[PDB]
Amino acid sequence: AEVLLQPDFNAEKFSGLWYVVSMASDCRVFLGKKDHLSMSTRAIRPTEEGGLHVHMEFPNQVDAEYLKVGSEGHFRVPALGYLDVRIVDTDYSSFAVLYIYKELEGALSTMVQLYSRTQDVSPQALKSFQDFYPTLGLPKDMMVMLPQS
Structure with a gap:
């Protein structure tokens, strides 16, 4: 399940x-x-x-510093408890797939996020995300398509 x-x-x-x-x-x-x-x-x-x-915004505002780890695109985010963040795939102009390994009140877990440059997710953005998260052992029941607030 390589990342x-x-x-x-x-x-x-x-x-x-x-x-x-x-x-x-x-x-x-x-x-x-x-x-x-x-x-x-x-x-x-x-x-x-x-x-x-x-600068995160949840329509609350949270700022977080993504600190470089082993190479460009590899980060840790102490403010959010993210132990390892990897930019897995991005075209910079429409989407990005992020891999996160995090700690929350002692529990270690895996997270995958799909970034989009707009509120609409292109079929290419969705394909990259849907092909990727199951490779990590994450079933569809552990996935959510976020609605606009």
């Missing part, structure tokens, strides 16, 4: 506004509130040492 970083990750092209449009996770907290969640935004700017500063 390989997309090569030559470019933080400047990854900057700007994204919508979280789909999610899949074995996190019991996520699974409990799955159908109550709504689409949210991630507004990104690149920082020094190849990191990202992410």
